[PDB]
From Swiss-Prot, chain A:
The gene is PSMC4. This is 26S proteasome regulatory subunit 6B. Belongs to the AAA ATPase family. Component of the 26S proteasome, a multiprotein complex involved in the ATP-dependent degradation of ubiquitinated proteins. This complex plays a key role in the maintenance of protein homeostasis by removing misfolded or damaged proteins, which could impair cellular functions, and by removing proteins whose functions are no longer required. Therefore, the proteasome participates in numerous cellular processes, including cell cycle progression, apoptosis, or DNA damage repair. It comes from the Eukaryota. It is found in: Cytoplasm; Nucleus. Component of the 19S proteasome regulatory particle complex. The 26S proteasome consists of a 20S core particle (CP) and two 19S regulatory subunits (RP). The regulatory particle is made of a lid composed of 9 subunits, a base containing 6 ATPases including PSMC4 and few additional components. Interacts with NR1I3. Interacts with PAAF1. Interacts with TRIM5. Interacts with ZFAND1.
From Swiss-Prot, chain B:
The gene is PSMD3. This is 26S proteasome non-ATPase regulatory subunit 3. Component of the 26S proteasome, a multiprotein complex involved in the ATP-dependent degradation of ubiquitinated proteins. This complex plays a key role in the maintenance of protein homeostasis by removing misfolded or damaged proteins, which could impair cellular functions, and by removing proteins whose functions are no longer required. Therefore, the proteasome participates in numerous cellular processes, including cell cycle progression, apoptosis, or DNA damage repair. There is a cross-link at residue 13 (Glycyl lysine isopeptide (Lys-Gly) (interchain with G-Cter in SUMO2)). Pfam families: PCI, Rpn3_C.
UniProtKB/Swiss-Prot annotation, chain C:
Belongs to the proteasome subunit S1 family. It comes from the Eukaryota. Component of the 19S proteasome regulatory particle complex. The 26S proteasome consists of a 20S core particle (CP) and two 19S regulatory subunits (RP). The regulatory particle is made of a lid composed of 9 subunits, a base containing 6 ATPases and few additional components including PSMD1. Interacts with ADRM1. Interacts with ZFAND1. Signal peptide: none annotated. Component of the 26S proteasome, a multiprotein complex involved in the ATP-dependent degradation of ubiquitinated proteins. This complex plays a key role in the maintenance of protein homeostasis by removing misfolded or damaged proteins, which could impair cellular functions, and by removing proteins whose functions are no longer required. Therefore, the proteasome participates in numerous cellular processes, including cell cycle progression, apoptosis, or DNA damage repair. This is 26S proteasome non-ATPase regulatory subunit 1.
Length: 55, 472, 152, 40
């Protein structure tokens, strides 16, 4: 099948070229949202701290 | 007959992995190199180089090579019954009578795994069938009925070059097994070929073998055959180092991590013998700190004696004793007094070490050391004394090192300015140096010039650790 | 040192140099790399009627040094005995890159409407219509339509 | 790892590194280094 055995190789190759570009950018955005998550841990408190004790 | 079961066990442990496992690691694998049994088999080849291989004597003669080379067949899933044949033939050595069927009867034994059946398609089984028998034959070079057979066995390995060049007809990357075995066996090629004479048309063998490994399969072949070519041009007359000066294509992944180390060592000996101090001593230094381990007894030692010849030629070397193997001491009986003659400025001792040890200096064979070592003695003198005093006289240093006249001291100081160590000029009336040292030279913006290279080197290694963190 | 023996400015000692070339060129691969300039002198000279062989050993030494587009230039300059070879390293890798240039050239000129192209240099099309007849008269036309893919 | 050309190839001794930084320098000599006082 020397007509399309070797040319269908690019077909499912272009797509993971693009995902190979893509997951990079998703990692580029999740650091941003990781920083947003970490800072939004600290908006509610640790000025107004009340005192109990562990049991 | 109780010890030959240990080769019986390790032999099956080798070709189980190699034959069945790396054939299954060749069928569909090797995304980069999933043939981990290839590195396992090179580990076992180092294991057969530690031990006796299989059947050199082993209290008998010639048991395994007539035995296991039969009947591989790669067929219907009862070829583990051919493995059962391989296992249950082992009553012959323990129980039956051993007979001699190696190094003479091997000539159809190599054709047995082809003349059984159409076994399989891949070449690492063929490289197995012509390597795993015949590499247990090469390390017995007693030159009587054994070396003509290494010669013909590696003529079968030249047929393995032929069936490396014309098998799978393009792009099945079995070269990441066969060049890995072929590095070893082509070194043993060069060994057995040059146990007798220099190799002449094996040079063109090596040239075209470097040519065929250019781009289609450029994996561990180019650098290793280039080590072969380099040591070829090293052992004999020195004409084709201009080939590396015009065709410097010497940069792989530097895979085997010691091949690159000793490669930089050999080309450090090259630049040492071309002409170099700086670049040669830094690649000698990089190969020195790129010594892989000390797990191989005293093999760094002679090669290190020839390694730091250029550091001896610096003149700024102390005694080198931290390297000294005590079994190297009886061979460095010249070399210890030679670095003592580096520390001493005596002239009669500078030529009496030569008059005492010229034969070991010929064992070195690198009288480029002695063609500049007198000049090294006078440069050691000029470095010491010119770092010592600000305004010295040329007469003080001259008739302190027996120069006897002002004008050759002038030529010494002039060729030292030309060689650029210190500022030292001449209060020209009859000589009588007027000079200076150099502190308050610079100390602040000049470090931060080099700190770009410091931290740019650091961030290079950052990204390299990133691209190495990519591997799991 | 085989090129300093060329002060005789005719091709009649260039031919003895080439009779040395096709004898020991693989040993003297170190030697011709400096002689690239005088191989250029041989190619530029139209009075040098063996300029076919000049471009031959030019593409040979550039196949050695790893030049490939100039291997293409002097591969076209090599002549009519260039394509006809059946050898398994040299000629087929360089006609691989040559007809790779043919198909990328026919893509770029298929991306170029109505002319203004780079013309057929006078040593293309040789194994195109000669190995094409191998593909045709081997009675499987899948390469014969694969070129029709590759030319657009 | 023997795969190269090579298959043909502090008691009194690390004190000898500083002593070969000292071997061309004043063995003991003790008189010279005590008689440099009284020549003036």
């Amino acid at each position: 099948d020397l007509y399309s055995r070797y040319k269908k190789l690019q077909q499912e190759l272009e797509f993971l070229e693009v995902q190979e570009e893509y997951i990079k950018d998703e990692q580029k955005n999740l650091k941003k949202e990781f920083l947003h998550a970490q800072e939004e841990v600290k908006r509610i408190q640790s000025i107004p701290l009340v005192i109990g004790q562990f049991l | 007959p109780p010890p030959p079961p240990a080769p019986q066990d390790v032999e099956m442990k080798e070709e189980a992995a190699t034959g069945g496992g790396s054939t299954g690691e060749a069928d569909g694998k090797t995304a980069a190199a999933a043939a981990e049994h290839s590195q396992r088999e090179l580990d076992t080849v180092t294991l057969e180089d530690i031990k006796e291989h299989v059947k050199q004597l082993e209290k008998a003669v010639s048991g395994k090579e007539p035995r296991f080379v039969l009947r591989a067949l790669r067929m219907l899933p009862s070829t583990s019954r051919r493995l059962n044949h391989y296992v249950l033939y082992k009553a012959v050595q323990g129980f039956f009578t051993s007979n001699n069927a190696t190094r003479d009867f091997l000539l159809p034994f190599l054709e047995e795994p082809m003349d059984t059946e159409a076994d399989l398609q891949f070449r690492p089984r063929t490289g197995k069938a012509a390597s795993t028998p015949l590499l247990p034959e090469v390390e017995a070079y007693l030159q009587l009925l054994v070396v003509i057979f290494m010669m013909n066995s590696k003529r079968y390995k030249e047929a393995q070059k032929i069936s490396d060049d014309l098998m799978q007809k393009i792009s099945t990357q079995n070269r990441r097994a066969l060049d890995l075995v072929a590095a070893k066996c082509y070194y043993y090629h060069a060994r057995v070929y040059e146990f007798l004479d220099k190799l002449d048309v094996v040079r063109s063998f090596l040239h075209a073998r470097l040519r065929t490994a250019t781009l289609r399969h450029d994996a561990d072949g180019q650098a290793t055959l280039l080590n072969l070519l380099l040591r070829n041009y090293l052992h004999y007359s020195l004409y084709d180092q201009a080939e590396k000066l015009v065709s410097k294509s010497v940069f792989p992944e530097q895979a085997n991590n010691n091949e690159w180390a000793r490669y930089l060592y050999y080309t450090g000996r090259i630049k040492a013998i071309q002409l170099e101090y700086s670049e040669a001593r830094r690649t000698m230094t990089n190969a020195l700190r790129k010594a892989p381990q000390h797990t191989a007894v005293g093999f760094k030692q002679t090669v290190h004696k020839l390694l730091i010849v250029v550091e001896l030629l610096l003149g700024e070397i102390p005694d080198r004793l931290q390297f000294r193997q005590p079994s190297l001491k009886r061979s460095l009986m010249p070399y210890f007094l030679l670095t003592q003659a580096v520390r001493t400025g005596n002239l009669a001792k500078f030529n009496q070490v030569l008059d005492q040890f010229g034969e070991k200096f010929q064992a070195d064979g690198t009288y480029t050391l002695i063609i500049r070592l007198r000049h090294n003695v006078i440069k050691t003198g000029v470095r010491m004394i010119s770092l010592s005093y600000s305004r010295i006289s040329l007469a003080d240093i001259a008739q302190k090192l027996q120069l006897d006249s002002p004008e050759d001291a002038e030529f010494i100081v002039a060729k030292a300015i030309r060689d650029g160590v210190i500022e030292a000029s001449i209060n020209h009336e009859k000589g009588y140096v007027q000079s200076k040292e150099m502190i308050d030279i610079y100390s602040t913006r000049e470090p931060q010039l080099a700190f770009h290279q410091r931290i740019s080197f650091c961030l290079d290694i950052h990204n390299m650790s990133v691209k190495a963190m990519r591997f799991p | 040192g085989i090129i300093s023996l060329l002060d005789e400015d005719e091709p009649q000692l260039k031919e003895f140099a080439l009779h040395k070339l096709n004898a020991v060129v693989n040993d003297f691969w170190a030697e011709i790399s400096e002689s690239v300039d005088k191989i250029e002198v041989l190619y530029e000279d139209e009075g040098f009627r063996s300029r076919q062989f000049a471009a031959l050993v030019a593409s040979k030494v550039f196949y050695h040094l790893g030049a490939f587009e100039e291997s293409l230039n002097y591969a076209l300059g090599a002549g009519d005995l260039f394509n006809v070879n059946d050898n398994s390293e040299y000629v087929e890798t360089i006609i691989a890159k040559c007809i790779d240039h043919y198909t990328k050239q026919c893509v770029e000129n298929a991306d170029l409407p109505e002319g203004e192209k780079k013309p057929i240099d006078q040593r293309l099309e040789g194994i195109v219509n000669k190995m094409f007849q191998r593909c045709l008269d081997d009675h499987k036309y899948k390469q014969a339509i694969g070129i029709a893919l590759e030319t657009r | 790892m023997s795969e190269k050309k090579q298959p043909v190839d502090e008691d009194n001794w690390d004190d000898d590194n500083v002593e070969d930084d000292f071997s061309n320098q004043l063995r003991a000599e003790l008189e010279k280094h005590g008689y440099k006082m009284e020549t003036s």
